[PDB]
């Protein structure tokens, strides 16, 4: 009360040597109110994970594979610090796994069978665990032992660290399948030589491996990469043509106990002091007693892992999927029919219950799964637990930084050709009361505000984007006196006007009554000085059309819009008095389901779209009661997106800019973690 020493787990005799030498040296230049280091010794990395889980140790650095095993029940560890490997200014932490090949050898990923493979080694990420994991279900039966089936798949290979007596075929190119730099084709660089030399047809390596072996691009153009869509790309389009995105070397911590922040403090203070080129006393990435003790010797320092980043996310879908398949042999029995059912992500129980009903009517084509925030749902879509949800533009943006794709837009304009008509978008406006004559778009300092939610187009990204372009700081909660912006930090002023109780207060879901367009507006009625909503929200909640007590008798007449020019006009005059265009909300998913989601959803909306009336008794998809459940209440249909299937491409060039301009101000723990993976 308080303890500060980090109980670091060591493997070798040698590693335990440096661990205490590391402790001694920290004590020389770090004060007593800072972190120290203690050492625990166990027989292998396997024991260390067990150690940290049972709270008899705190941290250890691991390769991607062991990171997976560590996250598993009952270990439940999570990655907290990352080694990086480039310059301080463009630090490289992850590496993408790729399958390199000679230019114009006329085959794709789905034709690897019967070709000659070059690998880095067994247990290795890019050279084995990724390719074989992702090719697992095309391997011939029996797939036990894996090595045999792999041998039976390729027409000859080099598999390092494997066994040549049991399986000879893995060695035709490495006659002595040697787990050592002795054998010429070992590891990243050797595996590539294999391909370069002609031994093999495909080599499995990092994206950087080629660049480290061919400095000149005229040489690189003689190679290509195999993309997962059974197509080829040039070696410098790794980012859009890789297998999986491995992390290099990760310190992991207890998911509950920790000590997460401490671990960072120690390591950050370590790299400041004895890191790289730092001191000539102690060397954190070098040694006397053998190499890669505690950390890799090519490591240039550390970076903290954003707290939103659990292991599933860190390792990433394609990795996790890969390494899963290696252990649990689940493949379709025998073929996957055509389109299994879609997991829609309900936002807490209000949406769940609508979802659950939607499910019943769909005869097994739509399953429901809920999370309590949308970011949580987004992450669920990323990791496989979920498949699809519809999102405000500002959150499609985030989804898109997280590598998810817009599949179909919502459309709000009545038309005989609704499904095949891209709409320019809806209009973000700023609504106040006629009664409050005093207010103007300039005069807002020290007034009270109501937002749909943080990170949404009309409720945040647009209004605040502008505000930031004026005031020049992110502290919006000080420019306003107080407000309601569900998703704000519980003790900002922008949570003071929200209406939820007590944990639910300011929570960015329907349990909070000022959430969304209706909620933002209601906030304006009861508590605030200005709502930031879409252009239709007033009509939609006045003149009796919203029957709830608070809305029953409010009149359109009673409200006005603030225009940018400083003047103010009635609600219907939004075309002449809006803040910006807002990209229509849209549905998003991951690439491998874009197909089935587009198919199922048109199948689905023809049954339950705005065509249908007598919605009571029937199930009607796009009508909720004032709460935009699953979809906005005024959705007319879902529009196709031909070649407009990318968050940048979909949202357009204006919106992506404006949101980008706000990057500095972002508060979002998911955006941090996704752009950490990489922007
Ligand atoms: C709605 O449909 C009309 C019909 O021609 C079309 O011109 C327009 O793009 C759509 N949007 C608005 C705001 O009128
Ligand atoms: C409802 O409207 C759409 C619009 O053309 C139509 O395609 C669909 O078939 C209709 N509903 C049903 C249940 O078929
Ligand atoms: Fe590797
Ligand atoms: Fe919106």
Curated annotation (Swiss-Prot):
Residues where Dimethylated arginine is found: 23
Result, substituting residue 277 to G: In allele TF*D1
Positions contributing to hydrogencarbonate 1 binding: 120, 124, 126-127
Function: Transferrins are iron binding transport proteins which can bind two Fe(3+) ions in association with the binding of an anion, usually bicarbonate. It is responsible for the transport of iron from sites of absorption and heme degradation to those of storage and utilization. Serum transferrin may also have a further role in stimulating cell proliferation.
Provenance organism: Homo sapiens (Human)
Domains as described in the record: Has a bilobed structure, each lobe binds a single Fe(3+) ion. Does not always bind 2 Fe(3+) ions. (Microbial infection) Binds to Neisseria transferrin-binding proteins A and B via its C-terminal lobe only. The L3 helix finger of TbpA inserts into the C-terminal lobe of TF, altering its conformation and probably disturbing the coordination of iron 2. Electron microscopy suggests that in the TbpA-TbpB-TF complex, TF is captured directly above the loop domain of TbpA in a chamber of about 1000 Angstroms(3) formed by the 3 proteins, where interactions between the proteins serve to abstract iron 2 from TF. Binding to TbpB does not alter the conformation of the C-terminal lobe.
PTM sites of type Phosphoserine: 370, 666
Binding site for Fe(3+) 2: 392, 426, 517, 585
GO molecular function terms noted in the UniProt entry: enzyme binding; ferric iron binding; ferrous iron binding; iron chaperone activity; transferrin receptor binding; transmembrane transporter binding
Outcome when changing residue 652 to E: In allele TF*B2
Name of the protein described by the UniProt record: Serotransferrin
Oligomer and partners: Monomer. Part of a complex composed of SLC40A1/ferroportin, TF/transferrin and HEPH/hephaestin that transfers iron from cells to transferrin.
GO annotation, cellular component aspect: apical plasma membrane; basal part of cell; basal plasma membrane; blood microparticle; cell surface; clathrin-coated endocytic vesicle membrane; clathrin-coated pit; cytoplasmic vesicle
